[PDB]
């Protein structure tokens, strides 16, 4: 129990009193474990290269049979594993006693080995030490291959023991890399805009204060506004990948701090944004898996997974038209009038459903219950949202009251939102009773903008049900 | 003035009253201005390709005429410029009246042109419109070329449109970050993201977390969680992102700035030195094709100096050098009342500003600033082997008691890099003798070398800027 730790702390001081440095300054290694494996995987059974002296390091993860003349361990590094074969025959007795030296070693210890490569008869690829030094001791018992809420609080344990953990976060990094190259290859320019600004939200802000300036500041909820200024400033294709903050409640698809990508693209229109969306997701998926088809456990690991097919193109569903269809209602314009409002409220009551109650929020609520689960076997776009839901989007060119907006869902979760910008400042409602507006007065070209939720995307592409599973150190009740 | 705006705004209304939308939905362009230049670069003077029709867009930055049947404009896009030559005979008269189609256009307007490519007689790459259309009006008067203060930092789009060099500055910023990302990734480093806010706490920003009812601290650095990933076996790890300091603001300090930190398992002191020398020499050669650059340290109105990034760079041992040049031994512990008074005395005698509070770390740092940092402007250099009291997370020097294996790089007296072997013995961890990170070490951190870079400051030196506000797109300021 806690006795383990204390005995191990005593070991550490004992070694020091005997003149052994259990945390040495430097150990020069000549080869990594993955490099070892790639270079020596093709030796014959029992084959041996005693003339090849190597320096290797790793974490002991298994302490096997004692055996007085033959010691066996597992040694891991960079998510890969080899065996350690300590044979009294090859041991350098000048540096210490064989049994004494290998007896001190416990699971989790990081070690530095000087030896040669080979396979055991049985066929196991091994490093054969002449000499083994402790580089950093593990003072606690590591959990074995069962593990609870400790994944999140001690992510390093999760990474060490759960093989799927490293895969998840490596996939995360590959996704962000892919997106960055994808955008760069299309001529896009990456910038950084402030994390701290002077505006609240409409989604509730983190607030802080710089005391030299005596100034309250707000963490950004999005990177929208200053990216659009850069478009005005002449940077015609422009983007940013980074954290945004929404001071809201936490759940499986919501974390208050999360990673977005937003881009703006001068002279792009609706179908460009659609095509960018379909090209991005299909190629990203193929890049990672070698197919457009993936398996996802929407309803947890204990239940059957479903297949999500990312083969383009993806379905497009007009929000109003589809609400009308499934509810057998006609939602007459403007969706403002308290008739249409009344109508939407009545739909809401009849079908359970909570609804404050407003024209835009009623529409959002109706869309949640009736549309956002239309497809689970493919991604799809909900498109042509009403202007009242979409104050920043350019008007639809043929359908009265609608916009050129598109919103992509995967298993009923929004991972993307895009639209053509409303660039006429005289049609822009917030410029009626009015920094953004001043931008538009200098001339914003026709521009398409798009945002991606990086964490939700990663969830789907790594088979996770909870956003906390794709964030290395999610913020938690200290408990 | 305000009149120009009011008049330009009535103009919009007037255009609409005539069936003309001044903010049309779409214009399909077929070529960008930079693509146009690359492709038609080699035309002869006066050569036209009347049969190539193209759709092009951009922003009008110059208006002039040669009578009423010949109009001349500068069109700019993606930082590059071509001429617009509207000739009466080439106009598509069916589409509208030539004079009143071109009379309306003003400096700042974004336009869509249908036309053919060619060079003017004088040799200027030009688009010759058949048809020219407003896509978005500029209702205000743009400041003239050479006439742009502090508007630059708020309304950065004005700065980007009027001052050619500012675009170049920020392009160079991005190239710098791209080089670093590639430099690390090619060496097997793995990029991650760690929390922007933590429970533990430089002087920090504070923010209230609504859902958990906590008051949290915005990160001042990414050190701790990156090291925990080392423990977790990600043996080469890094992060490029924002950190926040609730401190001062000046030419080298902004409340949020961009750092790169990495941790490198099994790396030592001279791995980090060689890394720094490789990185800076190669980054500079990549941007300039030489290791030497010009830098206006004392402002643009004075002569610049030359900074030579040719490796290796000098290493100066801080304590030894302070002692030497002040002919005064600093007896360990540097913490003692006696050595602190000794340091305060040296500071008093030399009329050097006393730090507040006058802790041993701050005294030593001030001493380094006054007696060492200033003397190497012609080259980057390292101050090394800092006392443990200055560097509580650094590993003990193998051979010099009291010191560490730390290195910190200066360019023209300004810190841009700080690196060291990590102390990994949890029993030598001063602040683990009274113990989330302390716990981490108990699971075993391998010997490790870590390093941080100050991306903004580096950009300043490589873009010849004296202020950090000129290398951040929106540096943080009062509303005024
Ligand atoms: O990935 C998300 N959303 C898709 C998207 O709206 C992001 C912005 C660019 C467009 C796509 C997402 C993840 C969250 O953890 C979250 C937490 C909140 F408190 C509120 C909203 C949130 O949203
Ligand atoms: O670039 C800087 N420093 C180099 C470095 O210390 C960064 C951390 C990794 C090591 C290198 C730097 C830039 C700032 O704007 C700044 C603002 C503050 F209020 C306080 C300190 C600041 O520091």
Numbering used by the authors:
A (entry chain B): 80 to 224, 226 to 227, 230 to 284, 287 to 439, 442 to 520, 538 to 582
B (entry chain A): 80 to 227, 230 to 282, 287 to 520, 538 to 582
Task: Show passages lifted from the paper.
Aminoacyl-tRNA synthetases catalyze aminoacylation of tRNAs with their cognate amino acids in two stages. First, the amino acid is activated by ATP to yield the AMP-activated amino acid, with loss of pyrophosphate, followed by transfer of the amino acid onto the tRNA. Malaria parasite genomes encode two different lysyl-tRNA synthetases (KRSs) that play a role in translation in either the cytoplasm (PfKRS1) or in the apicoplast (PfKRS2), while Cryptosporidium parasites and humans encode one copy. We present a selective inhibitor of both Plasmodium and Cryptosporidium lysyl-tRNA synthetase capable of clearing parasites from mouse models of malaria and cryptosporidiosis infection.
Addition of a fluorine in the phenyl ring at C-6 blocked hydroxylation at the phenyl ring of the chromone (compound 3), and introduction of a hydroxyl at the bridgehead of the cyclohexyl substituent was tolerated without loss of potency, while reducing lipophilicity and intrinsic clearance (compound 4). The cocomplex of 4 bound to PfKRS1 showed that the ligand retained the binding mode of 2, conserving key H-bonds from the core scaffold to the protein. The addition of the 6F atom did not afford new interactions with the protein or ordered solvent. The bridgehead hydroxyl was close to the side chain of E500, forming a weak interaction (3.4 Å) and interacting with the ordered water network.
